[PDB]
Symmetry: D2
Subunit: 499 residues, 4 copies
């Protein structure tokens, strides 16, 4: 006997042992009489058009694939629920927090960032940790990473960062010059790069890592009062990492290591679960916060802003078909129910456009009609109609315009947004020089110990040594600008790596 | 008080007066708070991307249209049933014919041929009369017209024909030189053209014209014995035509005359209906048939092959949403249930491929998962997976390959095709010189009376006068080949029209 | 001999008489050996798959259509040039106005609003008068109508307005209840409805109407100083209109009357031309203007803001292929060169998004690479890469990220936008009760004479009579709010129309 | 300094040192003023819709991906030429073989089979070796593999096989049970499976492997006489393989090993080349041939049918943009110039439909208009019009219908297909028990030595051990049927692997 993942078909057959196999039909429901030999003239003659059995199957085979995700293509998925355990209704009116003991179905996707569909699981990368809540006020998508922070803090750079992290356009190979020529030209990546190359760059499967919302968000309660917030869901199975040595072995011994581990855990009743916390910053604490509280390369320190528990995330169910239920999942940060609102984070504002945009391409204009994407615990009612591959009654014969004197849906005034006052020139403000070193300096000195600083510098050198000298030189100076000894240790190792 | 169609909204409100109007949401279910004023910074300030409510709706407004049908774009639709009244189980084992009193749900779409989606309903043009039978053996599409014949008999001439009947590629105007340059060079059109320029060329709506499969099909019974057949469905409401003068007033008075007629008819209870007949020809009779029995420009005369009644087509239901239920209708002549099979009719062979092909472009790769197109009375199970906009469970975790030791669907041997023997060179055979005037001579002399012959030439002459003279000369010569009087009457009128 | 449009094929053949016809190939460049008969097994046999000639052509026939414009679908196109004749460089620095005599290639598309591709040209409807200027600084699309104003003044009402002007979602029929339930509920439409229902509702083709940009636009000069402006391009052929009687005869005698008129004119050297004016309003005059100076339902009176000539628009070239040059034409109001900027106009703000959004759907992601859409007077260079159907080098092996130390394209600082100061609450402001009657009162009394006021009410009553009584009452009341005698005349004619 | 691939960006800069950097625009050509900072209201304010620069780059970054290939997704590409070195004009009249010394431009793509876009190069799999000749008679796509044979010999089983070779639908894990449940039920895979688990299962890059057209094809000379042939192109660099122990290291040390090798060879002037041979079998030798001469699991032994050399394949140019020139590459076995024609091979026949079908889905309706797929050395001319993303003049104002009197393209009678006589019942013929072991017995005993048989059995058992026992026993039985020591060796190793 083997692990449960390997016995999938075995169990599938056992769970059907009594009933008879179904009839094999065409996509049109017509039974086929033989699907192992083609319609031909004589045993050694040519194929016929009449054989619509071959065409109908071959045609659909020819149309299996869709465009993989432009980032976070390698994914693992599982389903479960979220349960409220504490009371934060003084901050947010969101139904998903309405009372202790309330559950909501969730869907999760774990992913790497750079690799394509076929890439190994056990590499050095950040990890996608997206969560879809199916609430009654519509869906809520918390599309977070395993990091509170990110490498850049203005969306316009994002296509550039991702191009630098993916394949050279001519050679179609990973390029350390592209990787580091960007990172060293944009030292705002100092805070996140440090995180990446330390021990938690390679987590041991998806159950031994935290998730963060990273952005600052806005909560809104029943009085109309608003605060800013951070989301942290911390692993109840404990932070556990892989060594460089063991990550590289598994990278060829089991390219689907994290996928397997997740499925096997759920299958044997070993259910992973996370603890959702929030931080809270008042509007007037945001005015005096020493950094930009919406800077995505910054955290809120725990001494001044402690973690306030909210509930538990539990995954207890495996997908049944991976394509339908994991590959077609779409998470839109702009899916926010009343009570949860975006901050002015320059990076979050961009993701409000990008995700629904890319989802209309990747999946199809009516991608929200796909079951796993469908807000199936709310009533979708509005004045949008048509589009390719319409799948419900298309809202019936309801009046399709607004306003109207025929009682088609109405707006709900309690769901209006919180109103903030803003004043300033409409222009492009330079954010390349917000404090790029301070919170990193703290991380290097005060969070890491002696050994971890050693391994941090070795991991950086072990990937920066393939970049040209003028690129190495500038990166080292950036590291020097956090701590002299930081750059020194990397520069001592690069002197050796260069022979 | 007005005709029922004009009161559509009025009635949608009355049928609802007992409820409260719904809540107006986004596509993602989120309630809208204001959908008449945009989110801007100051009363006379600019628009924000934070206004996702605008973008959600506008993005779907921008994607409302799909490609119109490349032919038969202007159409009318309704639903009803087919009911068996006579026994033809000796010829066909199809379940749709199984016993007397058997009902089957049907969908119908009426259409013109050349006009695009905005054209007028009351114009000279054939009429499409497509019927879809939702049988337990899968769907059956009988895609027929209002005429038993077509203008051509090889599918390689079809795109040409359509282009000649549509707009000038540079001026975008209907071009008489294109219509008649083609018809005069291809005299095999003389038959259908004579039908087209007769009174029936302009039916008084869709309820007063007959339907025809036109093609020769094949019927297989339970013993494996096969006959050839034609399908006729005649109007129970009686043939009734518009005159050129009335047709031209309605064309601007009410461009949607045949849509309004079909709708108000069903709404006011006047259910239209048709009587389905078949002709039968034995394989032997096919070998001695003077003409080619698979030549789409020939009828089987009624003296030699009388009409055998089958059942009743009835339309008793109006669509609730036009787009969802009529514009997305896709009829595939290749959808054939066991007991019905195609003949070698060259024109039917080409339609076996073309319709599914254009449905994957017009509607999409999985258009069969659109409700009206779904074989919702059959159990569709096979090894076809994925594709854009996949909407069921994608057949779940079932094994997706055949053969397989895990009891996925199995082929049904009794659904194999009838075996016919063919012999000959694989080679493009010339069919342009099959008899092109005999059956047209009979029609002119023995079906039409004098008045009708008189009008036939005036309708022809009124359109052919716009073609250059050398085209005129050639078309007249084709008509003289049918009957010298037929040609010389046309020519007498052209002599006048040419001043 | 006939008119030039109908002799189009005759000339094509004449223009080629010297040379010999090309070889018939497949889409892959393979010569065919017969394209009139299909490859079959014997003369009466079935069709084969290895007839790739048939497949290659039919599959492309099957994909001829794309989506028609969601609005303004019926159109006619021509090309020519714009010539500067006066110096407005003190208001704008745009290269298209650089010096007197500077010409710029243009492309113009005329259209109606509500009809679909097959509808008639001579109907009551606004007209689209779009102009594309191919300047050195990129393309400038001036997407203008034949009115200075529009029915609404918020873009959130557009989908609704167009829904109410189009077909009933269940009967697919034009619905006078929708039309006037909307207009009566939204009286802001009083101004444009009064234009629509007067003589110029039906122009005598596209060579006898004026063009307008309707929206306020911003002009910026070389010093950085801004002003607000309107564009008027008046016809040098003279205003000329059709009567209700002649418009309706021509709606069935020549559905393509405006297209033929334009084509014939150009083909006979009678080139139509238009005179481009601007109005100018300073930022100070913008604060004291009696109404909102960005309200699309308002004009700037000539006495206070006179016309300032600019140049000529001239159409002297017919399209060679209508589909490739007129149906694939794409205008974007967001295509604006340095010198010309949008005003805060709530309607124009939304056209900034809607058009590129719809163009990616209707045509494709890279619709800007289609010839007629291409800024072929400019040099495109940036960091945008790939997409469906990429057709040039894709910009080669150039670095695809920014910033870079590898001499990829750079920004141009002198192309930065003008800076304006805005202040106020970010909220959705009500514009429903902007003065809806004052400028209409002036039109009714001071611009129309006794005869024209008569016909204006008659045209209104003819169409408003078909709507329910409660909608009539409301609409008349909106007309009495302009002038008692305005609502009176309409009510006396409706009294008659209701028997 | 480093290898040439890593210095791609360095060199691109050097090759431009003399010029100035371009100007960064939008896609419409409009210059940008800053592309590092987003347009916001105040330094810490929300993003605006007015920021079209952001939308135009993000909207295109959201649509970068296209569906990877359904098979052979991981690939490597170059360009070069084919040169005729011998005369085979007595067999084929094709213009690519016209005279000794004639050159044709070619395009090659190497590829694995099962892995997706991100998998490793150095795995056990067959290798694609597609070749596209740009002929004056239109493209010729010789789409070969690195083996003369395949696992199956009917196309209906192909989706199944592939499904069995890829990922479990539920676990998204490679499944050994699936692999060998298929392979053991279908022992016609014995032949190719023995090829795959031998040394040549893992070639040392794409330059040290042969290429085979595999299928039997037809040649036709100028007299209309025809023969059958096999295409073998053998590596001029010599066969070279990797050991299991080196392939697994490289699989995590350089997943793109073969991609880097190809580029580095060409970039350093070391151009790889192949020698094209053919075998020939007369129509009369095909009749007596002991096995089915169109069976894709069978080779033509060299003693009886010796290689005849034809020409050289040389690759001497790297792609400049990988996506445009390698990812968008499209081969069609159906692209065949006069002189070359398909054999009745059941597999090949299916491939005549599949490839254009999937290319329309993957790339788009007009994929042949992409530069790298264009037949840019023939003149394409026909009656196919329009489609999404229409790019040339759409063939201008030419008559779009056939036949016509206006001198639009004409068919070429010399380009008709060779005529073969076929006879038999139209039915589905069972080919599952054509000889499945003979040629495999010959390979095991006569081609492999002692060591190689040893490594063959070790390779097979190492992967079959993970399959259930009832699958093991069957597969072993299929191996005993080739040779008792074959299935007994494998059984000895499995006995140990099962502890
Ligand atoms: N006739 C053919 O086209 C081929 C036959 N074979 C095998 O050879 C057997 C006998 O044919 P015959 O022509 O009389 O034999 P020959 O001795 O004439 O030729 C044997 C062929 O086998 C190839 N070969 C050698 N080792 C391997 C391996 N590990 N994997 C794959 N191919 C290999 C060689 O290709 P190379 O020239 O590259 O060394 C050679 O062309 C067949 O049963 C068949 O399995 C294999 C390939 C082609």
């Amino acid at each position: 006997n083997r692990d449960p993942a390997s016995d999938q078909m075995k169990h599938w057959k056992e769970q059907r042992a009594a009933q008879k196999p179904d009839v094999l039909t065409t996509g049109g429901g017509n039974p086929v009489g033989d699907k192992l030999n083609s319609l031909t003239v004589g045993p050694r003659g040519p194929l016929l058009v009449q054989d619509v059995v071959f065409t109908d199957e071959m045609a659909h085979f020819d149309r299996e694939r869709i465009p993989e995700r432009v980032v976070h293509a390698k994914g693992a998925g599982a389903f479960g629920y979220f349960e409220v355990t504490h009371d934060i209704t003084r901050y947010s009116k969101a139904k998903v927090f309405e009372h202790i003991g309330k559950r909501t179905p969730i869907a999760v996707r774990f992913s790497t960032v750079a690799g394509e569909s076929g890439s190994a699981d056990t590499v050095r990368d950040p990890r996608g940790f997206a969560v879809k809540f199916y609430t009654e006020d519509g869906n809520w998508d918390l599309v977070g990473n395993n990091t509170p922070i990110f490498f850049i803090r203005d969306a316009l750079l994002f296509p550039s960062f991702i191009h630098s992290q993916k394949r050279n356009p001519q050679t179609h190979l990973k390029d350390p010059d592209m990787v580091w020529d960007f990172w060293s030209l944009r030292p705002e990546s100092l805070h996140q790069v440090s995180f990446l190359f330390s021990d938690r760059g390679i987590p041991d499967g998806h159950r031994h890592m935290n998730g963060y919302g990273s952005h600052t968000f806005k909560l809104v309660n029943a009085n109309g009062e608003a605060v800013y917030c951070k989301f942290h869901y911390k692993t109840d199975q404990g932070i556990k990492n892989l060594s460089v040595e063991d990550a590289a072995r598994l990278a060829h011994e089991d390219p689907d290591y994290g996928l397997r581990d997740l499925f096997n855990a759920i299958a044997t009743g070993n259910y992973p679960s996370w603890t959702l916390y929030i931080q809270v910053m008042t509007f007037s604490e945001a005015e005096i916060f020493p950094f930009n509280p919406f800077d995505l390369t910054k955290v809120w320190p725990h001494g001044d802003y402690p973690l306030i528990p909210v509930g538990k995330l539990v995954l207890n169910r495996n997908p049944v078909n991976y394509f339908a239920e994991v590959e077609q999942l779409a998470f839109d940060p702009s899916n926010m129910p009343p009570g949860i609102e975006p901050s002015p984070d320059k990076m979050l504002q961009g993701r409000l456009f990008a995700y629904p945009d890319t989802h209309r391409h990747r999946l199809g204009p009516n991608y929200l009609q796909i079951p796993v994407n469908c807000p199936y615990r709310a009533r979708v009612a509005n004045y949008q109609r048509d589009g390719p591959m319409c799948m419900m009654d298309n809202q019936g014969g309801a009046p399709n315009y607004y306003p109207n004197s025929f009682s088609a849906p109405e707006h709900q005034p309690s769901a209006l947004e919180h109103r903030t006052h803003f004043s300033g020139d409409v222009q492009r403000f330079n954010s390349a020089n917000d404090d790029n070193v301070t919170q990193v300096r703290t991380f290097y000195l005060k969070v890491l110990n002696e050994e971890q600083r050693k391994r941090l510098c070795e991991n950086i050198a072990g990937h920066l040594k393939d970049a040209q000298l003028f690129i190495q030189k500038k990166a080292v100076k950036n590291f020097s600008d956090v701590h002299p000894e930081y750059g020194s240790r990397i520069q001592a190792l690069l002197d050796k790596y260069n022979e």
